[PDB]
Structure formats: C-alpha cells, structure tokens
UniProtKB/Swiss-Prot annotation, chain D:
Medical condition linked: Immunodeficiency 79: An autosomal recessive disorder characterized by childhood onset of recurrent and recalcitrant skin warts due to uncontrolled viral infection with human papillomavirus (HPV). Some patients may also have recurrent respiratory infections. Laboratory studies show a complete absence of CD4+ T cells.
Organism lineage string: Eukaryota, Metazoa, Chordata, Craniata, Vertebrata
Cysteine-cysteine disulfides: 16-84, 130-159
This protein's encoding gene: CD4
Domain named Ig-like V-type: residues: 1-100
Name of the protein described by the UniProt record: T-cell surface glycoprotein CD4
Domain notes: The Ig-like V-type domain mediates the interaction with MHCII.
Length: 50, 136, 132, 182
C-alpha cells in the first residue's frame, strides 16, 4: 500500500478503509529515462487484478 | 517541621475507588478502609476489623461496555497478602493538610515497580580521531 | 557525480560500471520500518523475500572466490561461442540490458565454470605451496 | 473567552472536547484552581469545590472525546470562569447565572404594580427586557417595575436577559383578579 500522510490525521476511527498503511514520502521522486522505450499493455496489467 | 497531618477516607462516589478492591482466589472483595485511614499527627492485641462486601459482577480497568461474571468458589476462603505500598492523594492551606487514598488507573501498580528499570537502544557504530593513515 | 538509483541504467556497460554501488545499496535497501489484517503478513512475506532474494546470489559470489564484489576477475577464459564481439563492440557500444539479451542463453553454462574450475584448482595448490 | 448564561435553579452543560474520539485524562477547575471534577481512568472524581454535590459529567460521552461539566440546581455564586484541562490544553468558559423573581408570589389586582428583580453575579451589568401577554414592554437592568397592571397582563410574561452578546429567557406567570367590565 501507501496512502498519503495527512489522511491518517482525520482519524474518524478509520475512514473508508485505510489506516494500516505506510505514510508516503514528502518528496516522491521520479526520473525521466532518455533513450528508453518499451511496450505498455493495459489489458494484461495485473496491477488491476490485485 | 511545623505542620499537621490528617488522614481520612476517600470522597465516596464509585464503589471501586471508594472501597478497597483486591484479588483473593477468584472472589472480589470491597472493604471499608475507613478503619485504617482515620488518624492524625501533631506539629512536631490490638487489631483492626475491616468490613468487606462481595460482588460477582465487576468492571476491571474501568473498561465500560463489557462485564465478567466470576463463578462462586466452594468452601471457606482465606487469602493472605502484605500491604507494601499506598496510593495517597494530597487534598486555608498553611498548617493542616488532609490526605486520602485513591486509585482508578491500574498503571500505578505497574509503575510502582517498574521505576527501577529503563530501556535503552545500543548504537554499536562510532568514530573517533586517531593518528593513522591507511596503506594499500 | 551522484546520479541516483539506476541512474546509469541508460548508458554503456563501461559507463554504468562507474556507479554500481549507488544501485547496490538498494538491492537490499533495509529500513522500511486487531491482529493479522491485510498487509499484516504481506509486509512480512515481502521483507523476507527481499532477504532471501539477496543472499541467494550473494552466496554464489561467496563461492566464486571474490567477496569483494561489484567486480572481480577469474582464471576462466571466455569461450568465443558466447557472443563473439570485440570489446569496443561490447563495452563501448552496448547497455547491460542489451548484453543480457544475448548472453542470457549461456547463463548456467558459464556458471558451471565459475562455480568450479578456479575454486577447485586455486586450492590444493596453495596447500602445496604451504608445504614449506 | 466563551460565555454561557445559566438560570438560577436550572441545569447547565459546559462542554469540553478533545482532538480524538477516545476517553483521556480531563479535569475541570475554576478561576482559583479549585478542582471541580475530572476522571481517573474511567472513574469520576469530584474535587473540594462548592459545586461538589451538584456537579457531574456524562461518562457515556468520554469514549467520544467529550468531557462535559454538568451543574444542576444552579446558584448565582456558581458564576465563575471554568477551565477544562485536556491533552495539555485549556478550554476556558465564563458561566454567568441569573435569577428573575416577581416581588409577589400572590395574585395581583388590576391597577396594582408588578416589580421584577434580577439576581445577578458580582461584576455583571446585564440589560433586561420583559413583555406581558398583552404586549406591554418594560426594560431595565436590576429592577423592572410596571406601575399599573391591566387584566390583559394576566398570564405568562417573557423576560430576556442580555449579557456579553448572549441572552437567556425567563418565563414568569402572573395572576391577577379584575372585573370583566368597566
């Protein structure tokens, strides 16, 4: 998992269904990758199933 | 070295904080400790009988919303213990100072012992200046 | 220059070798930091699998007498059948991903000699040098 | 600087709320640091204040993070600043208790006078306005007096006390005997 960091401050005896979840980093990192190309297949992406 | 010390019972209210609650072979006792906490001291057998009551339904740690029924015990019961400590609460404030017992929070019984202990985290790794230049 | 995790991934194998440690650190990473519950045994399982994942190959480097890893030499000669290219055709003109694309075919085959030859022979030999 | 107006002989509920919906240590004191009431775990304690026999909480709200000071049978001398101490934080409320009485408890005659007296705490300067069944209006501070009652003044008078932008309402029943013809 990973669900923000301030959402837990609302509390309300667990909102929706997230409390037991690692707080996010205050600086989410990224990096564009130059010269790197490859296939994307959303129709076989098992991230959805999980 | 010039004050007066008086002892009295609790302020009433709830039966659990008022009387003395303690364990004794599954049975729960509630005793009127007025027979103990009734004295005084100035400026500078014999035996005591304490009336007790029995209850089958009680609330532990003050956790409302739940209960517990203790089954009666057959035969005569006669537990034995030793009073090792007290739980007083300090109560026209320049000479006389009245005191009474207390309780409610059961963490007082554990702290009363664990004060002798503390837990620390060891950090094995350290550095320091030393006359040394490392060769290949 | 600090690039970042996998920061040299898009470069030649020669170039990438510059900063193998930046990757190495996070191969095991560490840190991370009503019972059961979802995630209750998942963070467990995952964090375990990380440790195993690491050591399984680390032990191989333990066997392949190096230990001081990231890079080390052997006494096993390269068989020309294993993708016959020149060094400039390899190291100065190919990424690690492109490399694996080919050499992956002989992985276990090469491991055979790495797992053995030198490890076997380097030793005995030494015991014999210890004769005097 | 919260202000609550009470009526003499009524009940009031002074609120305290923690950041979280759980029972924690709280304590109510007055402006002289005299303990009124608090908890010890789940138990109620009562301090050596003059409110002791008339102070309570609502323990069924403590698991909700609410720790109210309920004061019954309000007296004028219950007027004070009260402080709830909870989670290292202080919540302050000024209680002002008023009483309003007619000078007569007995039935009055037409043409007779009616005098209302506002009982008020030291240091308060309220305005009062009262209105009879017929719409007769009288205004004042301490004492409000109507010179001559009409038959049509018989019934429930409604009195508003204004203090600190707040108001509280008294209803007083006035009974008088008068002829049904001039």
């Amino acid at each position: 998992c990973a669900s923000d960091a301030k959402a837990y401050e609302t509390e309300k005896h667990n909102v929706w269904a997230t409390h037991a979840c690692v707080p996010t980093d205050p600086n989410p990192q990224e990096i564009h990758l130059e010269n790197v190309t490859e296939e994307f297949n959303m129709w076989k992406n098992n991230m959805v199933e999980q | 070295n010039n004050t007066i010390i008086r002892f009295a019972n609790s302020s009433g209210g709830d039966l659990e904080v008022t009387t003395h609650s303690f364990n004794c072979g599954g049975e729960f006792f509630y005793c009127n400790t007025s027979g103990l906490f009734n004295s005084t001291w100035i400026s500078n057998n014999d035996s005591i009988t304490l009336p007790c009551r029995i209850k089958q339904i009680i609330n532990m740690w003050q956790r409302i919303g739940q209960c517990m029924y203790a089954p009666p015990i057959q035969g005569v019961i006669r537990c034995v213990s030793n009073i090792t400590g007290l739980i007083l609460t300090r109560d026209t404030n320049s000479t006389t100072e009245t005191f009474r017992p207390g309780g409610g929070d059961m963490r007082d019984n554990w702290r009363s012992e664990l004060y002798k202990y503390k837990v620390v985290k060891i950090e094995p790794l350290g550095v320091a200046p030393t006359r040394c230049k490392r060769r290949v | 220059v600090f690039l970042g995790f996998l920061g040299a991934a898009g470069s030649t194998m020669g170039a990438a070798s510059m900063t193998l440690t930046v990757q190495a650190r996070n191969l095991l990473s560490g840190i991370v930091q009503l019972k059961l519950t979802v995630w209750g045994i998942k963070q467990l399982q995952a964090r375990v699998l990380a440790v195993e994942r690491y050591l399984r190959d680390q032990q191989l480097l333990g066997i392949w007498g190096c230990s001081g890893k990231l890079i080390c030499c052997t006494n096993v000669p390269w068989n020309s059948s294993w993708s016959n290219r020149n060094l400039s055709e390899i190291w100065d003109n190919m990424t690690w991903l492109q490399w694996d694309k080919e050499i992956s075919n002989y992985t276990q085959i090469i491991y055979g000699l790495l797992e053995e030859s030198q490890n076997q022979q380097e030793k005995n030999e030494q015991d014999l040098l210890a004769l005097d | 600087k919260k202000v609550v107006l009470g009526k003499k002989g009524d009940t009031v509920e002074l609120t305290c709320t923690a950041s979280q919906k759980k029972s924690i240590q709280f304590h109510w004191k007055n402006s002289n640091q005299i303990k009124i009431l608090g908890n010890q775990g789940s138990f109620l304690t009562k301090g050596p204040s003059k409110l002791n026999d008339r102070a309570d909480s609502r323990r069924s709200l403590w698991d909700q993070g609410n720790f109210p000071l309920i004061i019954k049978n309000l007296k004028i001398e219950d007027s004070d600043t009260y402080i709830c101490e909870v989670e290292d934080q202080k919540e302050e409320v000024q209680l002002l208790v008023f009483g309003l009485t007619a000078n007569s408890d007995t039935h009055l005659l037409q043409g007779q006078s009616l005098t209302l007296t506002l009982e008020s705490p030291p240091g308060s300067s309220p305005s009062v306005q009262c209105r009879s069944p017929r719409g007769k209006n009288i205004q004042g501070g301490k004492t409000l007096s109507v010179s001559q009652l009409e038959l049509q003044d018989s019934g429930t008078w409604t009195c508003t006390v204004l203090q600190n932008q707040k108001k509280v309402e008294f209803k007083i029943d006035i009974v008088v005997l008068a002829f049904q013809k001039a």
